Amino acid sequence: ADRYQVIFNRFVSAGVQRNAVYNIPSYEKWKEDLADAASSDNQKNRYLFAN
Amino acid sequence: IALAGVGLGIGTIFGNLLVACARQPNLTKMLFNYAILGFALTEAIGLFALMLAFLMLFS
Amino acid sequence: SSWRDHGISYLKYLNVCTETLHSTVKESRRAKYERWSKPCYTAQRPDGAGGQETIDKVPIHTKDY
Amino acid sequence: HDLPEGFEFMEHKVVNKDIHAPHENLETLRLTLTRQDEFLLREEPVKCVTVTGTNGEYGIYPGHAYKIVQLNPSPLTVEYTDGTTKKYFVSGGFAHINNEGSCDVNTVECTLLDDLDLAIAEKELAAQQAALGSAKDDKAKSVVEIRISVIEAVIAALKHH
């Protein structure tokens, strides 16, 4: 599967319930992005985490 | 024979340099400068041994 | 350790550990923690007649892992 | 029709320190001990935290280098700057250590070592060992051995103190 998505309801307050999304890329695409965040300046915030 | 411990020492520096550049790709500039610094310091010892060899070879 | 060779996934490994850890908790406190490690889930597809056909693709109980 | 991502509603993000920056001398580690999407401790300044990963035991103090540790069923210790020790027991999970001075220990289950009973733990070990003898197949034996490892760790953890 290219991705697994979860579509749920976020309870902001007693009267506010929005719709929220968790997209989870499968291993192959995730490790490829994790490899680019490590080597490249792109995705700075993820550079340390990826390495 | 002193150069054996010099050339090997240089290889040790560069061997670690590659690993450091792999696990910190966005810090390659500082590591390279330090690697050169270590090479020059070891080369100083190599020249000291070389000078002794020349003194005992040409005199 | 040896469970990886048998195909057991990491997630199933954690569920077994959590159940065992909840087992060791005092009887007074077991009620609180044990509510977090009691399987209550199933996978069902609506049958042709309008019934529930249970999918057996993933185990539910740690015994059957 | 674009939908928000579920992380937009979370206002406590992770701060990473740029590698090309000056160092700071930190005397406090901000710990976040979490169980099943519930924090037992939140950004708590502590002196040190001791965690058992697969390789071995790590003693994390402020300024520890960036590292990810795969925990194993074991005790976890937190020592405050005051001089107070708090001991939990975890069944698994991960520990993320950041060079900025933070440690987010996310566990599937984290229970204070006081809650656990040694008498219950001991007799469970005897029963599971008997179960291992009657284990039908290789898979069943592996599962039973997982339980024994946790139980023995619990028994050994409590016998230590």
Closest residue of chain D to C20, computed from CA coordinates: D147
* Phi, psi (rounded to 5 degrees) for B58: -100, 10
Question: Burial level of C39, CB count in 10 A (0-12/13-18/19+)?
Answer: exposed
User: Are the C-beta atoms of residues C22 and C36 closer than 8 Å to each other?
Assistant: yes
Q: Which of D10, D18, D160 is nearest to D85 (CA)?
A: D160
Enumerate the domain spans of chain D. 21-116, 117-161
The approach used to solve this structure was cryo-EM
Do the beta carbons of residue A29 and residue A2 sit within 8 Å? yes
Q: Would the CA dihedral through C12, C18, C23, C27 be positive or negative?
A: negative
The radius of gyration of chain A from alpha carbons, rounded to an integer in Å, stands at 15
- Note whether D16 contacts A8, CB cutoff 8 Å: no
Q: Chain D residue closest to B30 (CA)?
A: D20
Residue D41 exposure: Cα atoms within 13 Å on the Cβ side: 27
Structure tokens at B29: 């500039």
B56 shares contact with chain A (CB less than 8 Å)? no
Q: Distance between CA D118 and CA D142 in Å, rounded?
A: 24
D58 annotated ligand binder = yes
Whose structure tokens read 């993820």?
A46
CA–CA separation, B32 and B18 (whole Å)? 10
Q: Enumerate neighbours of A (3 or more CB pairs within 8 A).
A: B, D
Note whether D12 and D29 are within 8 A (CB): no
A14 — phi, psi (to 5°)? Answer: -55, -30
Rounded to whole angstroms, how far apart are CA atoms C65 and D64? 38
Chain centroid to Cα B2, Å, comes to: 13
Report resolution in angstroms. Answer: 3.5
Q: Is the dihedral of CA D42, D44, D50, D54 positive or negative?
A: positive
| Contact between A10 and D16 using a beta-carbon 8 Å cutoff | no
Q: Residue D139 is inside which H or E element, if any?
A: helix D138-160
